[PDB]
Coordinates of N, CA and C in Angstrom, one line a residue:
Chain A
X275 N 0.8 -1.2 0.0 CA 0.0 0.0 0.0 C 0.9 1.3 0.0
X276 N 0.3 1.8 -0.7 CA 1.5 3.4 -1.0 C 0.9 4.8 -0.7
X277 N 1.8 5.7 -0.5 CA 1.4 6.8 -0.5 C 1.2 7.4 -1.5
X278 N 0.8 8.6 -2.0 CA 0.6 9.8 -3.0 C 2.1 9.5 -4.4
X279 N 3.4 9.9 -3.2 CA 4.1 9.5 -4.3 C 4.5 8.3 -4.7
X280 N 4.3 7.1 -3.1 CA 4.3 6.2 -3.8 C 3.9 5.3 -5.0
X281 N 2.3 6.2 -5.1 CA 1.7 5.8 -6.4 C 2.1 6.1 -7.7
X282 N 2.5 8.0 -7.7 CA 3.3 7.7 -8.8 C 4.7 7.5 -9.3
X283 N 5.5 7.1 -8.1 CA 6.8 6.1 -8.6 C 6.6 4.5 -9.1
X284 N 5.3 4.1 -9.0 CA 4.4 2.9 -9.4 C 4.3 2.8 -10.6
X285 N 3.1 4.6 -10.9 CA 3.0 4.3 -12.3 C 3.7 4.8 -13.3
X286 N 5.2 5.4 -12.8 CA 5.8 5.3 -13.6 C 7.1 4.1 -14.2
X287 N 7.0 3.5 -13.0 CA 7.6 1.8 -13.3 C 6.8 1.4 -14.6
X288 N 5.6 1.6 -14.2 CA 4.7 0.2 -14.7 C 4.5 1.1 -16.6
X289 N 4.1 2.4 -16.5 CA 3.5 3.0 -17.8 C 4.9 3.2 -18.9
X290 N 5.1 2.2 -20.2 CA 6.2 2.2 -21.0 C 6.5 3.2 -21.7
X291 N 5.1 4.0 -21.9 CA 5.4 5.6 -22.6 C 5.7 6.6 -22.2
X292 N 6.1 7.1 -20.9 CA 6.6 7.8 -20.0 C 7.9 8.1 -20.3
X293 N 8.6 9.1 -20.4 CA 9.9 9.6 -21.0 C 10.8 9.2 -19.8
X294 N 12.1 8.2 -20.6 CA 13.0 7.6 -20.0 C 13.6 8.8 -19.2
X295 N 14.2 9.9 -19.5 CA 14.8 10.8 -18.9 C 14.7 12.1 -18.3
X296 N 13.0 12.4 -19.1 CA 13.0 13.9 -18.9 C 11.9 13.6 -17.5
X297 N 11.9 15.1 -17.1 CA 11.0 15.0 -15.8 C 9.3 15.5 -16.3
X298 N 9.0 14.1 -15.5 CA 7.2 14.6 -15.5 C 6.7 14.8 -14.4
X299 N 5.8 15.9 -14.9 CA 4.8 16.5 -13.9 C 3.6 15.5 -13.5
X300 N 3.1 15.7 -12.2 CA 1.9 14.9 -11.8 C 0.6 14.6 -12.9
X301 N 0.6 15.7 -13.6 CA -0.5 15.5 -14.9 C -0.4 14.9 -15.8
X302 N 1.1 15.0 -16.4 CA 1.8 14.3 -17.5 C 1.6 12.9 -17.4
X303 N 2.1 12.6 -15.9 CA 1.9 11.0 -15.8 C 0.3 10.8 -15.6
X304 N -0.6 11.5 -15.4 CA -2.2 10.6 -15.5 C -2.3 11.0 -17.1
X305 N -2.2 12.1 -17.7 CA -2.3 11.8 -19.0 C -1.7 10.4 -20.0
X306 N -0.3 10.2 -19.7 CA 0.2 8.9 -19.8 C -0.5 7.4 -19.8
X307 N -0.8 7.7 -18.5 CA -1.4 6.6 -17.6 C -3.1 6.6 -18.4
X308 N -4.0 7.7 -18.7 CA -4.7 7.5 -19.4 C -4.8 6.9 -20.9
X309 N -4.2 7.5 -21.6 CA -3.9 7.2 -23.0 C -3.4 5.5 -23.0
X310 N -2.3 5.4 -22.3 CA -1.9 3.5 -21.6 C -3.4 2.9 -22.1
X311 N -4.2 3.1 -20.8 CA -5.4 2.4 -20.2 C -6.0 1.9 -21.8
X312 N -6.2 3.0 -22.1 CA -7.2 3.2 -23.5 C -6.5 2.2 -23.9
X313 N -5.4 2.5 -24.5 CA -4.8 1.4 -25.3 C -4.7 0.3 -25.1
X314 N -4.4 -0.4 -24.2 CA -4.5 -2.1 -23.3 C -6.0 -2.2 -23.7
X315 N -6.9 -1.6 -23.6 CA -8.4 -2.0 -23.1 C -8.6 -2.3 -25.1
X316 N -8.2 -1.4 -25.6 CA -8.4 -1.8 -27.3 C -8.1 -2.5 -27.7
X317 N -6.5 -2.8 -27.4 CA -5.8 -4.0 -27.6 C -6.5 -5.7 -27.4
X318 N -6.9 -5.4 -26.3 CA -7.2 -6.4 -25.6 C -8.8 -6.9 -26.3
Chain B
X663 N -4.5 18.0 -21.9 CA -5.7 18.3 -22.4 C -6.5 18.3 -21.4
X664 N -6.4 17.5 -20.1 CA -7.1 17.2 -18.7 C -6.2 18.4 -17.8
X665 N -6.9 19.2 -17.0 CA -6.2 19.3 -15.9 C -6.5 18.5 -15.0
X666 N -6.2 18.2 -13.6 CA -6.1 17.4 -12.6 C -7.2 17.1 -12.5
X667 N -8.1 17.8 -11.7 CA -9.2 17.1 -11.7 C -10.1 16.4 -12.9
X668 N -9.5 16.9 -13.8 CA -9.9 16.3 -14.9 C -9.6 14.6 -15.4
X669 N -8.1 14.5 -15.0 CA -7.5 13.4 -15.1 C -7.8 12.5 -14.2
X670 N -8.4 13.0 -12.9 CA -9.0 12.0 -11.9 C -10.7 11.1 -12.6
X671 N -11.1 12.6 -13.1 CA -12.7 12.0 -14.0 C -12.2 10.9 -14.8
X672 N -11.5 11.6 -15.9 CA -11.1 9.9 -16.7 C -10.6 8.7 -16.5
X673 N -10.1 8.7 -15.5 CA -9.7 7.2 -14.8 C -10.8 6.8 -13.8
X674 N -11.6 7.9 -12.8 CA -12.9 7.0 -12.8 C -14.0 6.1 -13.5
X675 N -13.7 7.2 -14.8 CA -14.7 6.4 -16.1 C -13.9 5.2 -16.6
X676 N -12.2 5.4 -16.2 CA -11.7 4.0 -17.5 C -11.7 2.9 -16.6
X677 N -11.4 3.1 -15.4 CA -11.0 2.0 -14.3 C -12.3 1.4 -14.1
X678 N -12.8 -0.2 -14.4 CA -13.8 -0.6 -13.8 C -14.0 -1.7 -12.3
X679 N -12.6 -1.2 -12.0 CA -12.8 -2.1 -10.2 C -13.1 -1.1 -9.0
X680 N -13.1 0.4 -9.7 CA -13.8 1.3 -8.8 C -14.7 1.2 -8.0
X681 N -15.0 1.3 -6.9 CA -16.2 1.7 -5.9 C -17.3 2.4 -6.8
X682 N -18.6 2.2 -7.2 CA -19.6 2.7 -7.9 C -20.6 3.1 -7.1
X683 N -20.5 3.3 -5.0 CA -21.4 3.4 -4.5 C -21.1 4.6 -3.1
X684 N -19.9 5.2 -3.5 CA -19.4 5.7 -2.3 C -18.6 6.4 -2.7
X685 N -17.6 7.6 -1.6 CA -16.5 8.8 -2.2 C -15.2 7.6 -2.5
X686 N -14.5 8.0 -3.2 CA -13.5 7.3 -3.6 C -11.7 8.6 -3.2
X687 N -11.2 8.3 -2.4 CA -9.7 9.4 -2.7 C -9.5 9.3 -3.5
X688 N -7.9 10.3 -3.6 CA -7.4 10.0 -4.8 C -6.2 8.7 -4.7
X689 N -5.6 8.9 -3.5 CA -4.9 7.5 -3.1 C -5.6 6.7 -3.5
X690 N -7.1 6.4 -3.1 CA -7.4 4.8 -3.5 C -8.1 4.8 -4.8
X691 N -8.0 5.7 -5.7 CA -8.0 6.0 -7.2 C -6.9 5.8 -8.0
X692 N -5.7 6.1 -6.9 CA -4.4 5.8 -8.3 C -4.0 4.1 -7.8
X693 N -4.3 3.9 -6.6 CA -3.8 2.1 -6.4 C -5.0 1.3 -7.3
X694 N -6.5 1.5 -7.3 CA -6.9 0.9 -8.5 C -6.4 0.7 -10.0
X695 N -6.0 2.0 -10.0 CA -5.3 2.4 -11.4 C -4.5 1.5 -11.2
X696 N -3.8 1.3 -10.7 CA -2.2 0.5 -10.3 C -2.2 -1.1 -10.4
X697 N -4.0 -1.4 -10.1 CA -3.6 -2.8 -9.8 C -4.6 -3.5 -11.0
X698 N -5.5 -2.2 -11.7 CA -5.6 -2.5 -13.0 C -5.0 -2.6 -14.4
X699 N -4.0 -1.1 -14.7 CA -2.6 -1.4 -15.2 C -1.5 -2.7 -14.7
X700 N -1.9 -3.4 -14.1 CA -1.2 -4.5 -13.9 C -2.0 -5.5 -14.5
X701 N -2.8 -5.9 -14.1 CA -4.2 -6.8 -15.0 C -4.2 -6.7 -16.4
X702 N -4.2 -5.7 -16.7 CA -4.1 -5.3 -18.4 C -2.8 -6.5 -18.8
X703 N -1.6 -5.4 -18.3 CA -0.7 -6.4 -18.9 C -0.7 -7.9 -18.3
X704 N -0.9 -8.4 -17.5 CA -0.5 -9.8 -17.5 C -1.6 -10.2 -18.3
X705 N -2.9 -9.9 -18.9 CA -3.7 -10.4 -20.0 C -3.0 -10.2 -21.1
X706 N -2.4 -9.5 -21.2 CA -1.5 -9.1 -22.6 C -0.4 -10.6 -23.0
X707 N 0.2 -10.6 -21.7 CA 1.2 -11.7 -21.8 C 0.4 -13.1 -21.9
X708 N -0.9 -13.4 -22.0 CA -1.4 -14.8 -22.2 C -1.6 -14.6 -23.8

């Protein structure tokens, strides 16, 4: 169970589209994490 | 294109292991997220 940042040091393990180097803002990674979702769920 | 609260709305709508009867945080909105992003892909990998 995690905290706030724990969560997003989570989703940025887990989400492959997330920029290897540059820094993201808390928005950037649910935008990420959205666009992901969509994509798995279509995929699938 | 979302700001924040915005980006909370669309993961309520995408995530379907959400609570549908009660307030939801945002902690226990991003660990759904988290443990449904995980489900995704290990369906991926069968």
């Amino acid at each position: 169970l995690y905290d706030m940042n724990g969560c997003y040091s989570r989703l940025k393990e887990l989400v492959p589209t997330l920029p290897q180097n540059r820094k993201v803002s808390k928005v950037e990674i649910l935008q990420h994490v959205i666009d992901y979702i969509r994509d798995l769920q279509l995929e699938l």
